[PDB]
């Protein structure tokens, strides 16, 4: 009475997360009747999982 | 006289030998497979002037 049982259990888990966010805003105004105004912002956001 | 499992048997003239044999051999094969795949992306962009 012989018995031979082989079990090969394998589990693999891998997870990667990366997020990049960059925001830059620049505004300049000069007046000397003369009036000048400039306003502009930029926003960038990215996320991957 | 020929007895097999307490039963009276008679060997015919054509059969040479008929002997009981256990000879128990069973097989069982089980295989599993699983795969996971996930993808996520969300990009945000904003501009103002």
Swiss-Prot record, chain A:
C-, N- and O-glycosylated. O-glycosylated with core 1 or possibly core 8 glycans. It is found in: Secreted; Target cell membrane. Transmembrane segments: none annotated. Monomer or dimer; as a C5b-7 complex it can also form multimeric rosettes. Component of the membrane attack complex (MAC), composed of complement C5b, C6, C7, C8A, C8B, C8G and multiple copies of the pore-forming subunit C9. It is linked to Complement component 7 deficiency: A rare defect of the complement classical pathway associated with susceptibility to severe recurrent infections, predominantly by Neisseria gonorrhoeae or Neisseria meningitidis. Belongs to the complement C6/C7/C8/C9 family. This is Complement component C7. It comes from Homo sapiens (Human). The gene is C7. The chain holds residues 313 to 361 of 843 of the full protein.
Curated annotation (Swiss-Prot), chain B:
It comes from the Eukaryota. It is found in: Secreted; Target cell membrane. Glycans are attached at residue 42. N-glycosylated; contains one or two bound glycans. Not O-glycosylated. Heterotrimer of 3 chains: alpha (C8A), beta (C8B) and gamma (C8G); the alpha and gamma chains are disulfide bonded. Component of the membrane attack complex (MAC), composed of complement C5b, C6, C7, C8A, C8B, C8G and multiple copies of the pore-forming subunit C9. Component of the membrane attack complex (MAC), a multiprotein complex activated by the complement cascade, which inserts into a target cell membrane and forms a pore, leading to target cell membrane rupture and cell lysis. The MAC is initiated by proteolytic cleavage of C5 into complement C5b in response to the classical, alternative, lectin and GZMK complement pathways. The complement pathways consist in a cascade of proteins that leads to phagocytosis and breakdown of pathogens and signaling that strengthens the adaptive immune system. Belongs to the complement C6/C7/C8/C9 family. It is linked to Complement component 8 deficiency, 2: A rare defect of the complement classical pathway associated with susceptibility to severe recurrent infections, predominantly by Neisseria gonorrhoeae or Neisseria meningitidis. This is Complement component C8 beta chain. It comes from Homo sapiens. The lineage of its organism: Eukaryota, Metazoa, Chordata, Craniata, Vertebrata. The gene is C8B. The chain holds residues 202 to 250 of 591 of the full protein.
